[PDB]
């Protein structure tokens, strides 16, 4: 015979109103008459806000930088609304509406004449930022499944993690970073300026500790 | 058969140069010498 463990009871998680995701529009309620440059520092480096959870216990953890326009948000919201349970699951958006303007000129035009016209709008997403958060009274298999289904469709790398999974991954990351055999850490060489390496490196590498490059994220750099 | 674009050292698509073992040993010994210098310059 085999043992029969008690099933996890769900009685402290109540579903609020509107379990489905809201509609995301293209341009905001007011257009920006001042054309802004394409500042690339909004996706380079670790994320500051929207890192931990808030209401739900499952969220998609980003592992790279990139821009998401109206089509990506529409695809994500449609997939969520078509692959969920409205009486047992509910998701809340974590990223704001796209507001960064992008200027595009005419096709087949000479270089010059100022900037072009504003077409669509995107939003900056850094590494380690939760894209969407979903909770409810379900378990972990199905939610991880239909969240990785969408994360594989995202341009940048993303995985479906939770609270315990994030805790375990941070624990093994710090365990690997505190038990290094070779005594030559990237931080020790970058901060103390060894062998004149500061000539070919970058001032942003002092805070990244060699864990970021442009927009990607290597979790095996240590 | 495989053709390299304009200049295999500058530009976008370039021929990547990698590391072997002699370079690693040289970096290790240089880091050891520099750590010894740091230790002797700490008093």
């Amino acid at each position: 015979v085999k043992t029969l463990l008690p099933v996890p009871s769900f009685e402290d998680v109540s579903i609020p109103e509107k379990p489905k995701l809201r509609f995301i529009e293209r341009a905001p309620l007011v257009p920006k008459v001042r054309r802004e440059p394409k500042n690339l520092s909004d996706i380079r480096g670790p994320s500051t806000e929207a890192t931990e959870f808030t209401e739900g216990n499952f969220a998609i953890l980003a592992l790279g930088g990139g821009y998401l326009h109206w089509g990506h948000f529409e695809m994500m919201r449609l997939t969520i609304n078509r692959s969920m349970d409205p009486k047992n699951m509910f998701a809340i958006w974590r990223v704001p509406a796209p507001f960064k303007p992008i200027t595009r000129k005419s096709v087949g035009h000479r270089m010059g004449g100022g900037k072009g016209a504003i077409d669509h709008y995107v939003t900056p997403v850094k590494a380690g930022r939760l894209v969407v958060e979903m909770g409810g009274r379900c378990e972990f298999e199905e939610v991880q499944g239909f969240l990785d289904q969408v994360a594989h469709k995202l341009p940048f790398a993303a995985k479906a993690v939770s609270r315990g999974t994030l805790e375990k991954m941070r624990k093994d990351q710090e365990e690997r970073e505190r038990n290094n055999q070779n005594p030559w850490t990237f931080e020790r060489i970058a901060t103390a300026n060894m062998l004149g390496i500061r000539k070919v490196l970058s001032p942003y590498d002092l805070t990244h500790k060699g864990k970021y490059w442009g927009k990607f994220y290597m979790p095996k750099r240590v | 058969r495989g053709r390299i674009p304009g200049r295999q050292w500058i530009g976008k698509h370039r021929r990547p140069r990698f590391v072997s073992l002699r370079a690693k040993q040289n970096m290790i010994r240089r880091l050891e010498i520099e750590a010894e210098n740091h230790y002797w310059l700490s008093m």
Binding site: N180, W184, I189, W213 | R14, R17, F18
Partner: peptide, 25 residues
């Protein structure tokens, strides 16, 4: 000259690559 953030990975410098290869886990 390229920007700091691009999509084609962009191979790093030779010294930076040597430093990342000698300082692995």
């Amino acid at each position: 000259g390229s920007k700091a953030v691009t999509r084609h990975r962009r191979v790093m410098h030779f010294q930076r690559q040597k430093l990342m290869a000698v300082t692995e886990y």
